[PDB]
Amino acid sequence: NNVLNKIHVAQPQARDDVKRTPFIPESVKNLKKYDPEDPNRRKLARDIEAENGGAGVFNVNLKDKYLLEDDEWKNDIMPEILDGKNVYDFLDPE
Amino acid sequence: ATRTQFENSNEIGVFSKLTNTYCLVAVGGSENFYSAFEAELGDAIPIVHTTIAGTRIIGRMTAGNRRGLLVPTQTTDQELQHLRNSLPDSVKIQRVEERLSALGNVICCNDYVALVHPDIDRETEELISDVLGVEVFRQTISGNILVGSYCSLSNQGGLVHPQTSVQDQEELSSLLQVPLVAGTVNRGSSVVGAGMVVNDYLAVTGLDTTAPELSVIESIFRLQDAQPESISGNLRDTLIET
Amino acid sequence: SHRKYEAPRHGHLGFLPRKRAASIRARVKAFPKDDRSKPVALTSFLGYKAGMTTIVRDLDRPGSKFHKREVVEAVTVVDTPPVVVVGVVGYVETPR
Amino acid sequence: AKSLRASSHLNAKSVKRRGVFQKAVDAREQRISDKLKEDLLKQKLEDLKKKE
Amino acid sequence: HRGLRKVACIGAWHPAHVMWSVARAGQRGYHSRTSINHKIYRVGKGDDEANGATSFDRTKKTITPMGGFVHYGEIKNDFIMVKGCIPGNRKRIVTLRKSLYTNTSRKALEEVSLKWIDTASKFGKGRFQTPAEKHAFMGTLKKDL
Amino acid sequence: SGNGAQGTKFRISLGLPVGAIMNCADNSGARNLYIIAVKGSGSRLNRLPAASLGDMVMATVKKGKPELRKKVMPAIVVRQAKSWRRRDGVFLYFEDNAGVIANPKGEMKGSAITGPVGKECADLWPRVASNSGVVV
Amino acid sequence: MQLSWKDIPTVAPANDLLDIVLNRTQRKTPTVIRPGFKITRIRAFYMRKVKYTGEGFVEKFEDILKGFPNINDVHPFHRDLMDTLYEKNHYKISLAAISRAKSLVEQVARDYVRLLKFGQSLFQCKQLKRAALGRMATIVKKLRDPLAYLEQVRQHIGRLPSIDPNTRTLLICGYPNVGKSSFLRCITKSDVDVQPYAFTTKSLYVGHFDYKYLRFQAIDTPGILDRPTEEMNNIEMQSIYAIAHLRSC
RNA sequence: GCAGUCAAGCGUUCAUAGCGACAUUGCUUUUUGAUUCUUCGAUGUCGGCUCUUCCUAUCAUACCGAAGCAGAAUUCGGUAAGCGUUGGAUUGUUCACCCACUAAUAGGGAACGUGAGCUGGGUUUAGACCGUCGUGAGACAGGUUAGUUUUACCCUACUGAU
RNA sequence: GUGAACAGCCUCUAGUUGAUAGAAUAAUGUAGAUAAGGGAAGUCGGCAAAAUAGAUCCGUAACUUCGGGAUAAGGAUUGGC
Ligand SMILES: [Mg+2]
């Protein structure tokens, strides 16, 4: 009965009209399988890390991998303070 | 069904968060753990190096599904700003204030049904249902108090820790509407939620997780494309011994 | 006997004798060597120390556990007005 | 562990001085020597005002 | 008997001389010291207004705190901000040599970016950066009107 | 550091010396813990080995279950009440001393931890971070 | 312990086992005394040389007896490989000769320290030390024939393959030169020689494979001949208890 | 150590006079890891707090050698004293043994380091009780209680200052 | 006057202002204090110091020669108008 705890799966009893299905984004289904030994494959930023220094020395730009309407201000600096009353409390839409 | 190790820890759900439309990883040291998510997920979903309150344990502080992401109170303004820059607009990102900080131990959920700690306040229970777009149920797994550490979910199925009674499994599956098996991960760890991460098409677990334990996990989440989970009866021969 | 319990020495014998120095401006004992292809470069500069203050900083240190996090620490501020040249001295190498 | 003056590390540290860390100094000793040449040109312009 | 702030046993019967290394009493301080590997953060300029303003703060202020440094005037000159603690005290003269050898570690290569400079008053518990902050936070006073 | 401790332990102030009675936070069945030794300690004449936040110390139960009592077993400190330093600009301190008992691997014994666990401990031990209801 | 035996430190020959202990007490304990010294300093000098050397042989001998697997009450199979290969009579005699020798060093130490407190000068205390180290040397010179045997059994018991009798195995038995080495080579990752003659393997070679998410270990025999079914080589007798004890295919 | 088996050497010219090394063989309470909680009586006074130095006969770290060493973990040996070597429990005790951490808890000297540096716990006067001995005064370094700790301003050394 | 009081503290009548002084504030002292976290790990030994304390009300054990033990222990409260 203790091994039966690891055998007996449970059943939902189906308890609604509402239907609940798993979500897969279609770029996952469109995606090829990664292959370890291949002349052509994506870099996998381990290997971006590898060509300029080892493990502890490599400096990751946490930026340059995110979404904005203009790339030209991707590296700008949030001010985060003016005289009193830091800027994150004031900014909003409108 | 991939084995992956953070620096030398078999614990993965502590150190990473994985939903259907994004993934969250820590920043410690070097990009070996980040690469293994790019081996599986590809470019299809954003994967984010982030810290929560200047820590590395980002899988137990946050909680969410493909619709929303919840961070605790101690998340600083820069780190809250950093999450929205990476993730697209389809996700809602909202800071939640409570008594208890760690939302990962307290909220276990799929895209559809959530479970909460009993001591959580109803002014957050309203916010959880509104942001994540899910139902909320107040329940304990086998009289253990943290439903996020001791249970792991997806839309496919659910996995619980082996102290769960069989009477407790039949009651609790009516709430989650998914099949439930008692199991262990990483050679007999009771903490099944922290050991692994799982979404509807991928499971990433520790290196210490044995091949009988991957057979249970690959079954209940139905990781191959032609698995109806009924092959656990075919895989019952592994279960009687192990 | 044999001291029954070993313990490290108190004080550093390198800094002996502990005495008052000769002047309130300490002389420099040794200079960087000579890189004789480079342009002319003054080796040192002298100014007046003035207090202390705190600085926070986003630590850009790969490998640490405080990588990409903020660090508060203390700095000194030395008042350093410009300094004007009035003399030239040459030194001949002797076997003395 | 190995002490500060061991022959193994001091042979290892000598290679790094042949590589990256001397290039940053030789880049540094060119930028500072540029501003010291512009220290004379600002101070000769103020001497031209008194020549007027 | 006869004290507790001292060394109890100062020698043995042989050699019958007090050794040169037995921690006697005497002068403390006013020695000359060399402390190496101190890292410059900021080279400001006296003609440059808003020295204390970083790329973040955007508040026009000079590194001279409110009511100046304690026991010293105002930094209206060029200055070198360096981390740690230079030996010596305030209003004394220091001499800044350069590095004596090419430094190897990664700590001597990193580019800093200061996010906020403190300029609250050091003569007490400084709670305001600029005097414009204090008159904003206090409100108005009797002596103002 | 030692075995089971992931990453390095930064310098925080030494609050709990040898012979310090501290509360037992978890639901293991003990009430209080008595520090007798600190693993990963130094060696200096007449010092007392002092524990800190997030160290594995050997601790005997003085009051609790008689099963847990009269045997020495490891314990991880989770609350300090001595003022320590975070590297962002604040000094903070908790209300009392606290510890949870563990195996030498670094795994927890009970299911729950009441009260806040320190942030420095929660980065250090993942199994404490699994059972931590309240962090900071 | 079970399932393997590798944690046995060493065992030295009796000429070198004496040279280890006696040179150690010359280096550790002090050596410089004078007749002008007060006699209690003289007595406690020589009491310690009997006591510390007396502990010296015991700490060596305590490490031997704990480390050897205690062939009685392990497992009916693991007792029985050592029965054919290591000759249980000669195994149990030599390990008993050390335990007798361990008690006599404790005997000489606890007796001569009791006699050395009644010394009256340097000369009588010097005689009681030299007789004490000599009688400890006599017991170790008597112990030559056990220790020469136990070094050569320490090596192959380290090189025994790990088998668990409770786990699921399968035996592969037959004649010499059938192909049961060649079967084992393609079924698992193992280095078993496939040379075409009769007795290639001289020990029970083990290979490990997987079926339906399980660990199966496959055990090979040297191949056997029935010829009397009563008396047999040491090589071929290894098979029969590998057949008798192991409960599997 | 004794009782033996030898004989590499010696005995003025020499085997067998007389020794006689390395060897060798035997018991002194149990050839089958069972036991075996056996701590069988030291008759002049030191121990510890503080704090320096020195020896190497090296416990740990450095580089090596050999092994009857797969890896790991160890065992043995060489150079080496530059650098470290602890926290507690019972006792006046050193010693002794246990608990626990640690890379390791190495050994010794300096009047068995160290009193105008301390402590007075112990030892070493007078008071007093018990046990034995003595007809008695009293003895016992048998047991247990209570008991005065003095001086530097001098020369020199040494840390500082003209 | 405060208070149970000839206690301690301050004052009225009466008496004294005598005890070598001046300038500076190093070490070590003698006398008197405070200290973050832990609470005897110090030591021959809790030596010393800290803690408790006046008062009204509630409440008080083993034992006992029946008188005691006892302020046993322990717990609430205190100004002003
Ligand atoms: Mg063959």
Side-chain angles (χ1 to χ4, degrees), chain G residues 18 67 71 79 94 109 111 127 164 172 183 190 196-197 219 224 242:
Chain G
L18 186 63
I71 191 167
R79 185 264 307 275
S94 66
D111 288 333
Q127 293 295 319
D164 188 76
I172 302 168
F183 180 78
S190 178
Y197 61 90
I219 303 167
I224 45 95

Side-chain angles (χ1 to χ4, degrees), chain F residues 34-102:
Chain F
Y34 180 79
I35 295 170
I36 60 168
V38 177
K39 285 193 289 296
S41 68
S43 296
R44 178 63 169 86
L45 184 64
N46 286 315
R47 286 191 188 272
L48 295 181
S52 66
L53 179 66
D55 286 331
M56 186 174 286
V57 296
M58 290 297 176
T60 64
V61 173
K62 294 291 183 182
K63 290 167 93 287
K65 288 184 182 179
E67 289 83 4
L68 274 73
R69 196 177 179 181
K70 292 171 95 287
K71 59 179 71 173
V72 56
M73 62 184 183
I76 301 168
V77 181
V78 295
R79 286 193 291 270
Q80 191 179 3
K82 173 67 176 69
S83 66
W84 74 90
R85 175 169 181 267
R86 283 182 178 175
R87 295 294 185 273
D88 55 354
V90 66
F91 290 12
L92 79 160
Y93 67 99
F94 286 150
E95 183 175 357
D96 54 353
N97 301 115
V100 293
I101 68 106

